[PDB]
Amino acid sequence: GYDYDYLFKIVLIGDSGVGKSNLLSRFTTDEFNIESKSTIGVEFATRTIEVENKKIKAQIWDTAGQERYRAITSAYYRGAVGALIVYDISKSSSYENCNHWLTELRENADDNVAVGLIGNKSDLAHLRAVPTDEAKNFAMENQMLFTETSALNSDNVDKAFRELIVAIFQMVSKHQVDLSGAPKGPTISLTPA
Amino acid sequence: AIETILVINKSGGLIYQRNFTNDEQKLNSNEYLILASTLHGVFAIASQLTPKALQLTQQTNIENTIPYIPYVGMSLGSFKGDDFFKEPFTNWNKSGLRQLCTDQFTMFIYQTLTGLKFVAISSSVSTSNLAIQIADNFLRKVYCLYSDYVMKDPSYSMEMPIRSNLFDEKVKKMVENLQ
Amino acid sequence: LPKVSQSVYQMLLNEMVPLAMGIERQISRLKIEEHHTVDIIRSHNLIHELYKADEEEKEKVLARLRNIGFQIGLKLSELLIFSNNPNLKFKEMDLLLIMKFICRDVWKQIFGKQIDNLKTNHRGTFYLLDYDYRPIQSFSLEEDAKNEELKMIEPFLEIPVGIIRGVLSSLGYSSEEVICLASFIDRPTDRPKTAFPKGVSFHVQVT
Amino acid sequence: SRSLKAMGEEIWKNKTEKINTELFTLTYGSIVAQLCQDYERDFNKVNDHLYSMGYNIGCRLIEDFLARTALPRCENLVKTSEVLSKCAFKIFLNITPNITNWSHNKDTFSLILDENPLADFVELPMDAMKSLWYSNILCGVLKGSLEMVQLDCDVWFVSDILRGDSQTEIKVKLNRILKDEIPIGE
Amino acid sequence: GIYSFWIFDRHCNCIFDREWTLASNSASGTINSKQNEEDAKLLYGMIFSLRSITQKLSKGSVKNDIRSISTGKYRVHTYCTASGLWFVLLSDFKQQSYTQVLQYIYSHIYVKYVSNNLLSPYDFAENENEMRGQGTRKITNRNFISVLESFLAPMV
Ligand SMILES: *C(=O)CCCCCCCCCCCCCCC
């Protein structure tokens, strides 16, 4: 099924315990090698979407470094053309670490990478600790898209992810043209003697 | 009998998965992306697991050179002559995953200096050291062929899937010769 | 003649001290068979428990294990007499012949090696000396905890005492005129050093 | 490499120390007799303690069995039956139990002990004629070993020649093949 | 000869560590040292990941297991048993494979001095809370370490 024209690499990075694993429960093909997070450091999900009549495959790398991954986690951003920074609006530490994560991405990831901001567990309004205004203001200064996601408020992260892939495709897509009455009959020799 | 060849562009992710087994088709396209990305990650892990004894003292820059086989390739494009190279060449990935041994197949990995990765799975299980030389020579053969017919292609974005017609058939002929 | 693997037999024979503690605790890890739950307690925990439970508890467990060894020896003696047919008489010609029979036959059949030399005071007690004592050749705790080793293998040394006591029974002298005690006082005198450092001595007295 | 049976006689012939069967009978009989004596002859759940013994010893014995044979992990029960019929019993007790009574969907089966070296010559009393099994240790070892191969299976006794039935049977029904464990880090 | 020796169990927990040094037999043998706890979990991650890759693309009806894994400098010799007990070994190339050596270790050191060593435990994850990689109850049997060092002394 090697029909997809382009293969984009996206990294789903965020603070430990934020709930990334539940965040990428939707935009997946829920099969294949499960877990493997603690083994090498990443778990893999894929999505297929058509943009401008061209199939695109997006590979999602939900890396995390607990105690062992110092250099490998850095190497895993070798050519990521997308990033999906995650924080929970429950504790200000996760939102505070977003600048540190963005610094690592822009220092190590691919040049002019399209990176966004996701606010997970927004249904729990009881223990909110980061307002939407501050998150949006932080997104404005750093050229990022921002949204808030929840289990009850699902189908928003899917649209944000498709929109991020569309933003990437408008940047790393070289323009092309669709390249798609021949003579018939018996010929006669005309080469010189 | 190299039954499968796959290549990983520069940062994980699969761009070519032509296989030459008779009929297995057990793994769909989706799982092979996971396989390639896992191979890249395991390569990264293997880089950072050198024993302490060799980290501070290598003294082994004579064995990295790969002796050349006469006609491992076949029996060209930008190249010319009876073979792609007659001289012996050097190893680049002196601190990375190099093969995987299994009783039913043997995987060989050849990493370009730039970052291109070429993986060959062979059903054959050689003293487990000469086969490294055979695999490296064949994979540099395939890398030269890729540099000919995939890099000199106007309609091919960098580090994207290799949807070409000359490259795949020529590597098919090349692996057909080697058995 | 039929045979059984020595490994499984030795594993069963070692599995009496965990029996001896577990059954005594039952008189005094949850798990299901098919519909009813049964408690299973790990074997190695019971040796620790037997080491550090009580003096009277330990005495009861040791007596029970001695009874097991007594039954083994009592049943085994008749078959050995039927098969090998030694030159012994019923009650007593001399104790030296009886102990020679035990050393030459019983330990050959139970363990894989003939028991080593034996002392003789010629009137009272006999000492049977065994080097490296097969059924505990792979028994250890720790590099440093060496003194604990001797004190916490001690219950395992009762089954051969029971075997000797039983073999003495059904051969004349009963289990009132015979007292037997095992100990670790033996040295590895000059033989090559094995896994276990200490030997075994069986101080058996009859009258 | 070779068939399971051929591996069985090859290992049994010249790759194992041996001990007389009669001594094994005496030792196990002494164990069961002392259990009967000290537990007030309440035969209802003396069997449970023998089962616990079997579990405990089998958990160690599986290590020896796999170290000797070095077989791959068993996936389906058609192959597990072959294994524990034609090599596992052969190495230890030198017997070859037969396999019959394949349940539907290949879920369960039964081991028929043509000879039981654990109970070679025993005559139970009338009290134990329909209360005691006397070979519970064997099924205890079977499951204690099979647990360590990552597959759970309830095993029990259907009949025994000692009690007076035609043949001794051991149903070894499965419950679930529990999956391997993976590390977790959060 | 060799560089280091590792033993894992069914419970994804490293059970034994032995690190070697320059070819002197009495090397810096830090046994079960906390300083190598970091570079054991990722080794287990390597072995588990490549084992999963091997099983996924396997064919036939045997469910093959990985034999050895060679990097540029060293190579890994691995032996996995049905009971879930992996014997890994880091070593320079020098020779084809260590399958006989690892089998001998399993069948004459571990099985003899741990499984048949009722004093010591088995399945070292006890009563939950360390069954899944988070724990340390590594073996410190006198006979195991002594005999193992004696056996690997010639090869180094
Ligand atoms: C897949 O590997 C299945 C392996 C077969 C199970 C192991 C059975 C070993 C125990 C057999 C019984 C031995 C006799 C015990 C009586 C004391």
Numbering used by the authors:
A (entry chain l): 7 to 186, 197 to 209
B (entry chain h): 2 to 76, 98 to 147, 166 to 219
C (entry chain e): 37 to 64, 87 to 265
D (entry chain f): 7 to 192
E (entry chain g): 2 to 157
What do the study's own words say?
We describe two different conformations of TRAPPII: an open state that allows Rab11 to access the active site chamber and a closed state in which the Trs120 lid encloses the chamber to enable Rab11 activation.
Viewed from the “side,” each monomer forms a chamber in which Rab11 is sandwiched between the core and Trs120. Somewhat unexpectedly, we observed that the HVD of Rab11/Ypt32 binds to the same pocket on the Trs31 core subunit that binds to the HVD of Rab1/Ypt1 in TRAPPIII. We identified three different ordered loops of Trs120 that contact Rab11.
